[PDB]
């Protein structure tokens, strides 16, 4: 039946494609042409519609496609843009859950993680070959992403930017397949140049390529490598930035058989190079990750936990920590008698001194071509290859020697965190988009106003991973409706993992050990 595609597709063309993939193709072709007209985009490539009608996927997508022949092989790099359609329902999957002696099945919709199967990709490749004529071409996966059903398609600015970013990545991957030279400390280490860095206690969120908010408590900014006394580059003005890492810190309530009860879980939510640089490679990513390490290694992250004193509406007010402590009460942090010293004491008794470094990993994110190696490095059939790629990336940064710090085959680079991440946003009182991750441990304690039993039910939902994830997802959504509100939109899900402490030691020390010295701007607190 599915093998009749061999007859169905032999000749001719048809009238088809869903309403969103149709509209999306039309706007993306318009944007391509305007970008060429304004000379922002080069006219060396093609945009294609992938149909659920003409070919074998549940979800249609547009394909950002670039090509070159590399050493005789035709190579195509594709960055799919999934187009979910609110009016189209793909048949659901049966989730059978063996609840001890009780067996029950939950049916559920396929998300981009379930949709982007290995065959989904292979079908994308085949269609491109039909559309490009390159039937013997190899196709590079730049990472599928999704442009969600919900918003109006008239945002030409964002859509233009999506094409721009997607072609950037396509050029990188053709280049890196072509053998292009890597990013390294040697390029930064001018004989007359040094690095410096600071922690930004932002007070604001940051936004992905489609404009959705990303939680961050601290933005780590690594300054441009340079030195006073160097030749000024004519009449210029520039931001002195090299890269940045977005992160936040939760306070996880963790077991112990003497440590205090909460863990300073430092979570990377995003990794970006400064906007003036176009390329996106593993070496650039890996180098930037050292920015999160310094958050607790040299500086002190705990300043981010200070309550917004004077602000009534602080949903994550530290005062909530008193509900997990022996007080079983909110600390009065509204008062003129609440001091910096009292804050430090709450933490002395409640929060552990040893930082833990972890990060999100998203196969469908803005950095998916790279996120995918870090995800496969967690485990599975190609873990060894993904790990080899990552250690090679750091060695490219330092000129070898990562191996002088530890054995990557005894110490895999990233461990699973188990509980995965539901992403989404909610609207605040003025209708702005805010990250749903705000109901973190302090957030949830204030949301239940001290009802510890309600908190613990939620907390167990977010921690006990012997419970099938569908059951956990349903309870997590039930809790958002009661505590966050009904104005909640869900977005593409993601993985989380723990960076191996030895990977971290080797990355940070190896860079410092080759002379790429970085000064702290916050010289003392």
């Amino acid at each position: 039946a599915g093998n009749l595609n061999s007859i169905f597709q032999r000749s001719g063309r048809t009238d088809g494609g869903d309403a969103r993939a149709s509209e999306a193709l039309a706007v993306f072709n318009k944007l391509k042409e305007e970008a060429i007209a304004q000379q922002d985009l080069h006219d060396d490539f093609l945009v294609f519609r992938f149909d659920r009608d003409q070919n074998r996927v549940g979800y249609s997508a547009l394909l950002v496609v670039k090509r070159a022949a590399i050493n005789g092989q035709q190579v195509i790099v594709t960055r799919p843009l999934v187009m979910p359609n609110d009016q189209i329902t793909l048949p659901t999957k049966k989730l059978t859950i063996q609840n001890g002696m009780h067996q029950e099945t939950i049916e559920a919709e396929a998300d981009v993680q379930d949709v982007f199967t290995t065959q989904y990709w292979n079908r994308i490749c085949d269609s491109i070959r039909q559309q490009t004529g390159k039937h013997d071409a190899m196709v590079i996966n730049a990472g599928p992403t999704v442009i969600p059903a919900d918003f109006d398609l008239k945002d030409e600015l964002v859509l233009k930017q999506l094409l721009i970013k997607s072609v950037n990545l396509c050029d990188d991957m053709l280049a890196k397949r072509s053998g292009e030279q890597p990013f390294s400390v040697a390029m930064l280490k001018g004989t007359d140049e040094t690095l410096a860095a600071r922690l930004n206690f932002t007070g604001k969120p940051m936004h992905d390529s489609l404009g959705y908010p990303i939680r961050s408590d601290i933005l780590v900014s690594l300054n441009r490598v340079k030195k006073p006394g160097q030749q000024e580059n004519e009449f210029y003005e520039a931001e002195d930035k090299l890269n940045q890492v977005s992160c936040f810190v939760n306070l996880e309530y963790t077991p112990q058989p003497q440590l205090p009860p909460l863990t300073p879980a430092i979570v990377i939510t995003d990794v970006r190079q400064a906007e003036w640089l176009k390329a996106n490679t593993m070496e650039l990513y890996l180098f930037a990750l050292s920015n999160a390490f310094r958050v607790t290694a040299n500086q002190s992250w705990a300043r981010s936990l200070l309550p917004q004193l004077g602000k009534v509406k602080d949903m994550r007010d530290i005062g909530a920590i008193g509900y997990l402590s022996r007080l079983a009460a909110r600390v009065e942090t509204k008062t003129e008698t609440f001091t910096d010293q009292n804050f430090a004491e709450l933490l002395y008794n409640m929060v552990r001194p040893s930082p833990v470094f972890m990060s999100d990993l998203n196969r469908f994110g803005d950095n998916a071509a790279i996120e995918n190696v870090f995800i496969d490095a967690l485990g599975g059939v190609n873990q060894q290859r993904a790990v080899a790629a990552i250690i090679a990336g750091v060695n490219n940064l330092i000129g070898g020697g990562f191996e002088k710090f530890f054995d990557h085959n005894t110490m895999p680079i990233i461990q699973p965190y188990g509980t995965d991440i539901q992403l989404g946003y909610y609207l605040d009182g003025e209708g702005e988009k805010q990250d749903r991750r705000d109901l973190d441990v302090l957030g949830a304690l204030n949301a239940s106003d001290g009802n510890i039993q309600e908190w613990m039910s939620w907390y167990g939902t977010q921690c006990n991973v012997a419970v099938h994830p569908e059951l956990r997802a349903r309870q997590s959504k039930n809790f958002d409706r009661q505590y966050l509100g009904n104005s909640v939109t869900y977005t593409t899900r993601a993985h989380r993992g723990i960076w191996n402490p030895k990977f971290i030691e080797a990355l940070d020390k190896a860079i410092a050990s080759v002379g790429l010295t970085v000064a702290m701007d916050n010289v003392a607190q």
């Binding site: 590079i140 996966n141 991957m173 196969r363 496969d376 599975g380 190609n382 873990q383 993904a386 699973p416």
Partner: peptide, 12 residues
Amino acid sequence: PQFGVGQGSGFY
């Protein structure tokens, strides 16, 4: 508990 792998490329 298990890790699925999609069709990644370039690095392998």
